[PDB]
RNA sequence: GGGGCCAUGAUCGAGAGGGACGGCCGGGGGCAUUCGUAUUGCGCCGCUAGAGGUGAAAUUCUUGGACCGGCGCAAGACGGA
């Protein structure tokens, strides 16, 4: 992708920052073509810290390297939590993965939050007495 | 059987009630219709090895392609803010 002055080749970064894991998924503008996808579990071997901000930081640094090899310079952030019937708050790996991209020599633009929210939800897991412990 | 006569005979309508009429009001009820994103399943494409879950793990699901991205198809619930 030869561009004059070396302009920003914008991509879309889908950050599935849920609990127990964190997906750092970078695609093209259409999202159909995956440039690079690495999760927090791919950088750690203990399942308890797959959602740790350190695990998401290593994934953001690895996905930032693959984008530079192909020509991607800027990223459109689309943060996403679990959403749907489950919780809608992003996990601890949201701020770490997003900040690690900005500190890895990448450009950030048009930050958004696409979390699946229902106009009317189905029945959530756990009885009417809830997950008691 | 025909007339005369009486001040000729009907208390009030309740800050009781029923009924009517008037312009409104309401997630009131029944029927029909429309829409909304989610959830699960399925098809095609992309990339890739884990993904699910937990205090920690395991059962389970994974190179016959899971989880994740995009496209749009079906079904039944439900009607968030």
């Amino acid at each position: 992708p030869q561009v004059a002055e070396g302009e920003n080749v914008f991509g879309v970064c889908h950050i599935f920052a849920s609990f127990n894991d964190t997906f750092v998924h970078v695609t093209d503008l259409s999202g159909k073509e995956t440039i690079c996808r690495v999760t927090g579990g791919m950088k750690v071997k203990a399942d308890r810290d797959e959602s740790s901000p350190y695990a998401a930081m290593l994934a953001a640094q690895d996905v930032a390297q693959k984008c530079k090899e192909l020509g991607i310079t800027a990223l459109h952030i689309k943060l996403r939590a679990t959403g749907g019937n489950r919780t809608k708050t992003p996990g601890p790996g949201a701020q770490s993965a997003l900040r690690a991209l900005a500190r890895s020599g990448m450009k950030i633009g048009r930050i958004e939050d696409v979390t699946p929210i229902p106009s009317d939800s189905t029945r959530r897991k756990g009885g009417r007495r809830g997950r008691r412990l």
Side-chain angles (χ1 to χ4, degrees), chain A residues 1-119 121-133:
Chain A
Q2 45 276 350
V3 194
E5 206 188 0
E7 296 181 357
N8 308 122
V9 181
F10 287 88
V12 183
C13 184
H14 301 82
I15 307 181
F16 189 9
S18 174
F19 294 92
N20 301 323
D21 202 334
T22 297
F23 289 72
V24 188
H25 193 174
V26 172
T27 64
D28 62 326
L29 293 183
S30 61
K32 187 174 181 180
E33 287 291 337
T34 287
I35 296 301
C36 181
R37 50 174 305 271
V38 282
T39 76
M42 296 184 181
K43 298 302 179 178
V44 297
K45 289 300 170 295
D47 306 5
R48 61 179 174 271
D49 52 324
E50 294 179 348
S51 175
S52 177
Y54 186 83
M57 185 180 63
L58 297 183
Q61 295 180 180
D62 201 323
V63 72
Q65 180 66 213
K66 190 64 176 181
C67 294
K68 300 180 178 180
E69 302 176 359
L70 303 179
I72 306 296
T73 312
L75 294 179
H76 281 339
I77 305 301
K78 286 187 176 58
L79 182 59
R80 171 177 175 264
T82 306
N85 207 344
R86 300 172 57 182
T87 176
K88 305 172 183 57
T89 299
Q95 298 289 342
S96 183
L98 177 52
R99 181 181 182 179
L101 290 175
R103 295 306 302 269
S104 181
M106 202 69 61
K107 294 295 182 180
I108 304 301
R110 292 286 176 261
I111 300 181
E112 204 182 359
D113 172 76
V114 277
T115 302
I117 51 177
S119 300
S121 179
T122 58
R123 188 163 186 86
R124 192 184 172 184
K125 202 171 191 59
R128 59 177 291 100
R129 295 163 55 184
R131 182 184 184 269
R132 54 204 177 280
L133 72 161

